[PDB]
Amino acid sequence: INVVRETMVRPAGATPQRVLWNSNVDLVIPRIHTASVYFYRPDPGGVLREALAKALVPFYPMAGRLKKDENGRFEINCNGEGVLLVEAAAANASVDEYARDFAPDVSFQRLIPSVDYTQDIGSFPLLVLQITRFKCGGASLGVGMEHHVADGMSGITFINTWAAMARGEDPKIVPYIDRTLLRANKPPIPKFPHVEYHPPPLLKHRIAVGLFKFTKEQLQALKSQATNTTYSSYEMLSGHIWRSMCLARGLDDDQETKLYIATDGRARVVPPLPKHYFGNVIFTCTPMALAGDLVSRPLYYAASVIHDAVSRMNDEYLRSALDYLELQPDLYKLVRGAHTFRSPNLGITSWSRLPVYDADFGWGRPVFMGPAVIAFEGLVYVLPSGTGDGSLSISLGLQPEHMPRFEQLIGQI
């Protein structure tokens, strides 16, 4: 990959010099990962830059820097120091030479800046953006965001705002920037045990990435296997992936397994949070069951443990977690990235609700929106459909000798 330019873009002007306090859910997050790649194709530089500065007027926390206070608690120091925007060019080109089946791999890590977090926090950009053009109109947007500034939803809002501005339009949107709403009460009064942050079950006493497609003529069936109640397609798919991995890993029947589902609390908090709330609201929801009960009983049981676990996270339960996390012994060791989604556990983060394919700059809309590289096993990305099909794709990492099976049980609905 060749590089034409590298610019540290700061807001167009007039930005507050805040220091944003961060809510407990603004601190417990898996690392600074959350990378993303956007793939474009032809349709029917001097503008992408100024649109970023214009979009950094309302979203000034993105142009800030990471900082600790006197207690070591992480903050967002609104420096206005800027966001890194790179415009790359590839000689070899052929976007699908490059992306091929769009499955994540190390070559996607090259559509993204290198950046050393190990350095001092106050002097790396919280967000980096790369624009890599190809041979006949292929474009690639790489996004690398720090978790302590905003969640995925608030990050996609920015990319959409940036794209809406580059189109020659205007944002309409003012972000709500105040994390004191999710402040735990004084004193913390937990009402639940909160097994979400309990240690995961242990397996009873590098890798291969896999991208899998679910047509619409597959999701129909899952809705056909639904019974007292009747569950939804995503709840079936999720349990289907839970069921498949429990069989792909050859788990013993009496083993406890844990599914780490990220949950958006913006809508279930009373009173409801403001629109365009800028921050991290992602709460953890962990349904659990024995490995045998998932795979021996019908698929609607796997949704039963998933649905009843998500339906328990009401305003009384979410605010009880904020009080709960205030009492934890170490602030960021509940952060568990590299070996929590080990066997027999797993994690499923879904993007089937974020307006992902709304990043039209003028080159059309994305054909692809997905993660750059799979770090390790256990994390399932529920991709959204771009062609309006009603489809649903998933990307996944597993041990090299569990993927050949996992591919065989996923295809059988």
Author numbering: 3 to 46, 55 to 215, 240 to 261, 266 to 451
Quoted passage from the original study:
One interesting example is the hydroxycinnamoyl-CoA:shikimate hydroxycinnamoyltransferase (HCT), which belongs to the BAHD acyltransferase family involved in the biosynthesis of a diversity of ester- and amide-containing natural products. HCT produces p-coumaroylshikimate by transferring the p-coumaroyl group from the acyl donor p-coumaroyl-CoA to the acyl acceptor shikimate. It is an essential enzyme in the phenylpropanoid metabolism, conserved across all land plants. Interestingly, unlike many other essential metabolic enzymes, HCT exhibits relatively low affinity toward its native substrate shikimate and can utilize a variety of non-native substrates.
We crystallized the HCT ortholog from the lycophyte Selaginella moellendorffii and solved its apo structure at 2.9-Å resolution. The SmHCT crystal had a space group of P212121, and contained two molecules in the asymmetric unit. Several surface loops of the protein (residues 47-54, 216-237, and 259-262) have low electron density support and are omitted from the model. Similar to other HCT orthologs, the structure of SmHCT consists of two pseudo-symmetric domains: one comprised of residues 1-179 and 392-411, the other of 241-391 and 412-451, and a long intervening loop consisting of residues 180-240. The SmHCT active site is located at the interface between its two domains with a cavity volume of 1372.2±10.4 Å3. Inside the active site, the universally conserved catalytic His157 acts as a general base to deprotonate the 5-hydroxyl of shikimate, priming it for the subsequent nucleophilic attack on p-coumaroyl-CoA. Apart from His157, two other key residues involved in substrate binding and catalysis, Thr385 and Trp387, are also structurally conserved in SmHCT compared to other available HCT structures. However, there is a clear structural difference in the arginine handle, Arg372, which resides on one of the three short loops (L1) surrounding the entrance of the active site and coordinates the shikimate carboxylate with two salt bridges throughout the catalytic cycle. A lack of electron density for its side chain suggests that this residue is extremely flexible in SmHCT, occupying many different conformations in the apo state. This is in clear contrast to other crystallized HCT orthologs, which have defined density for the arginine handle.
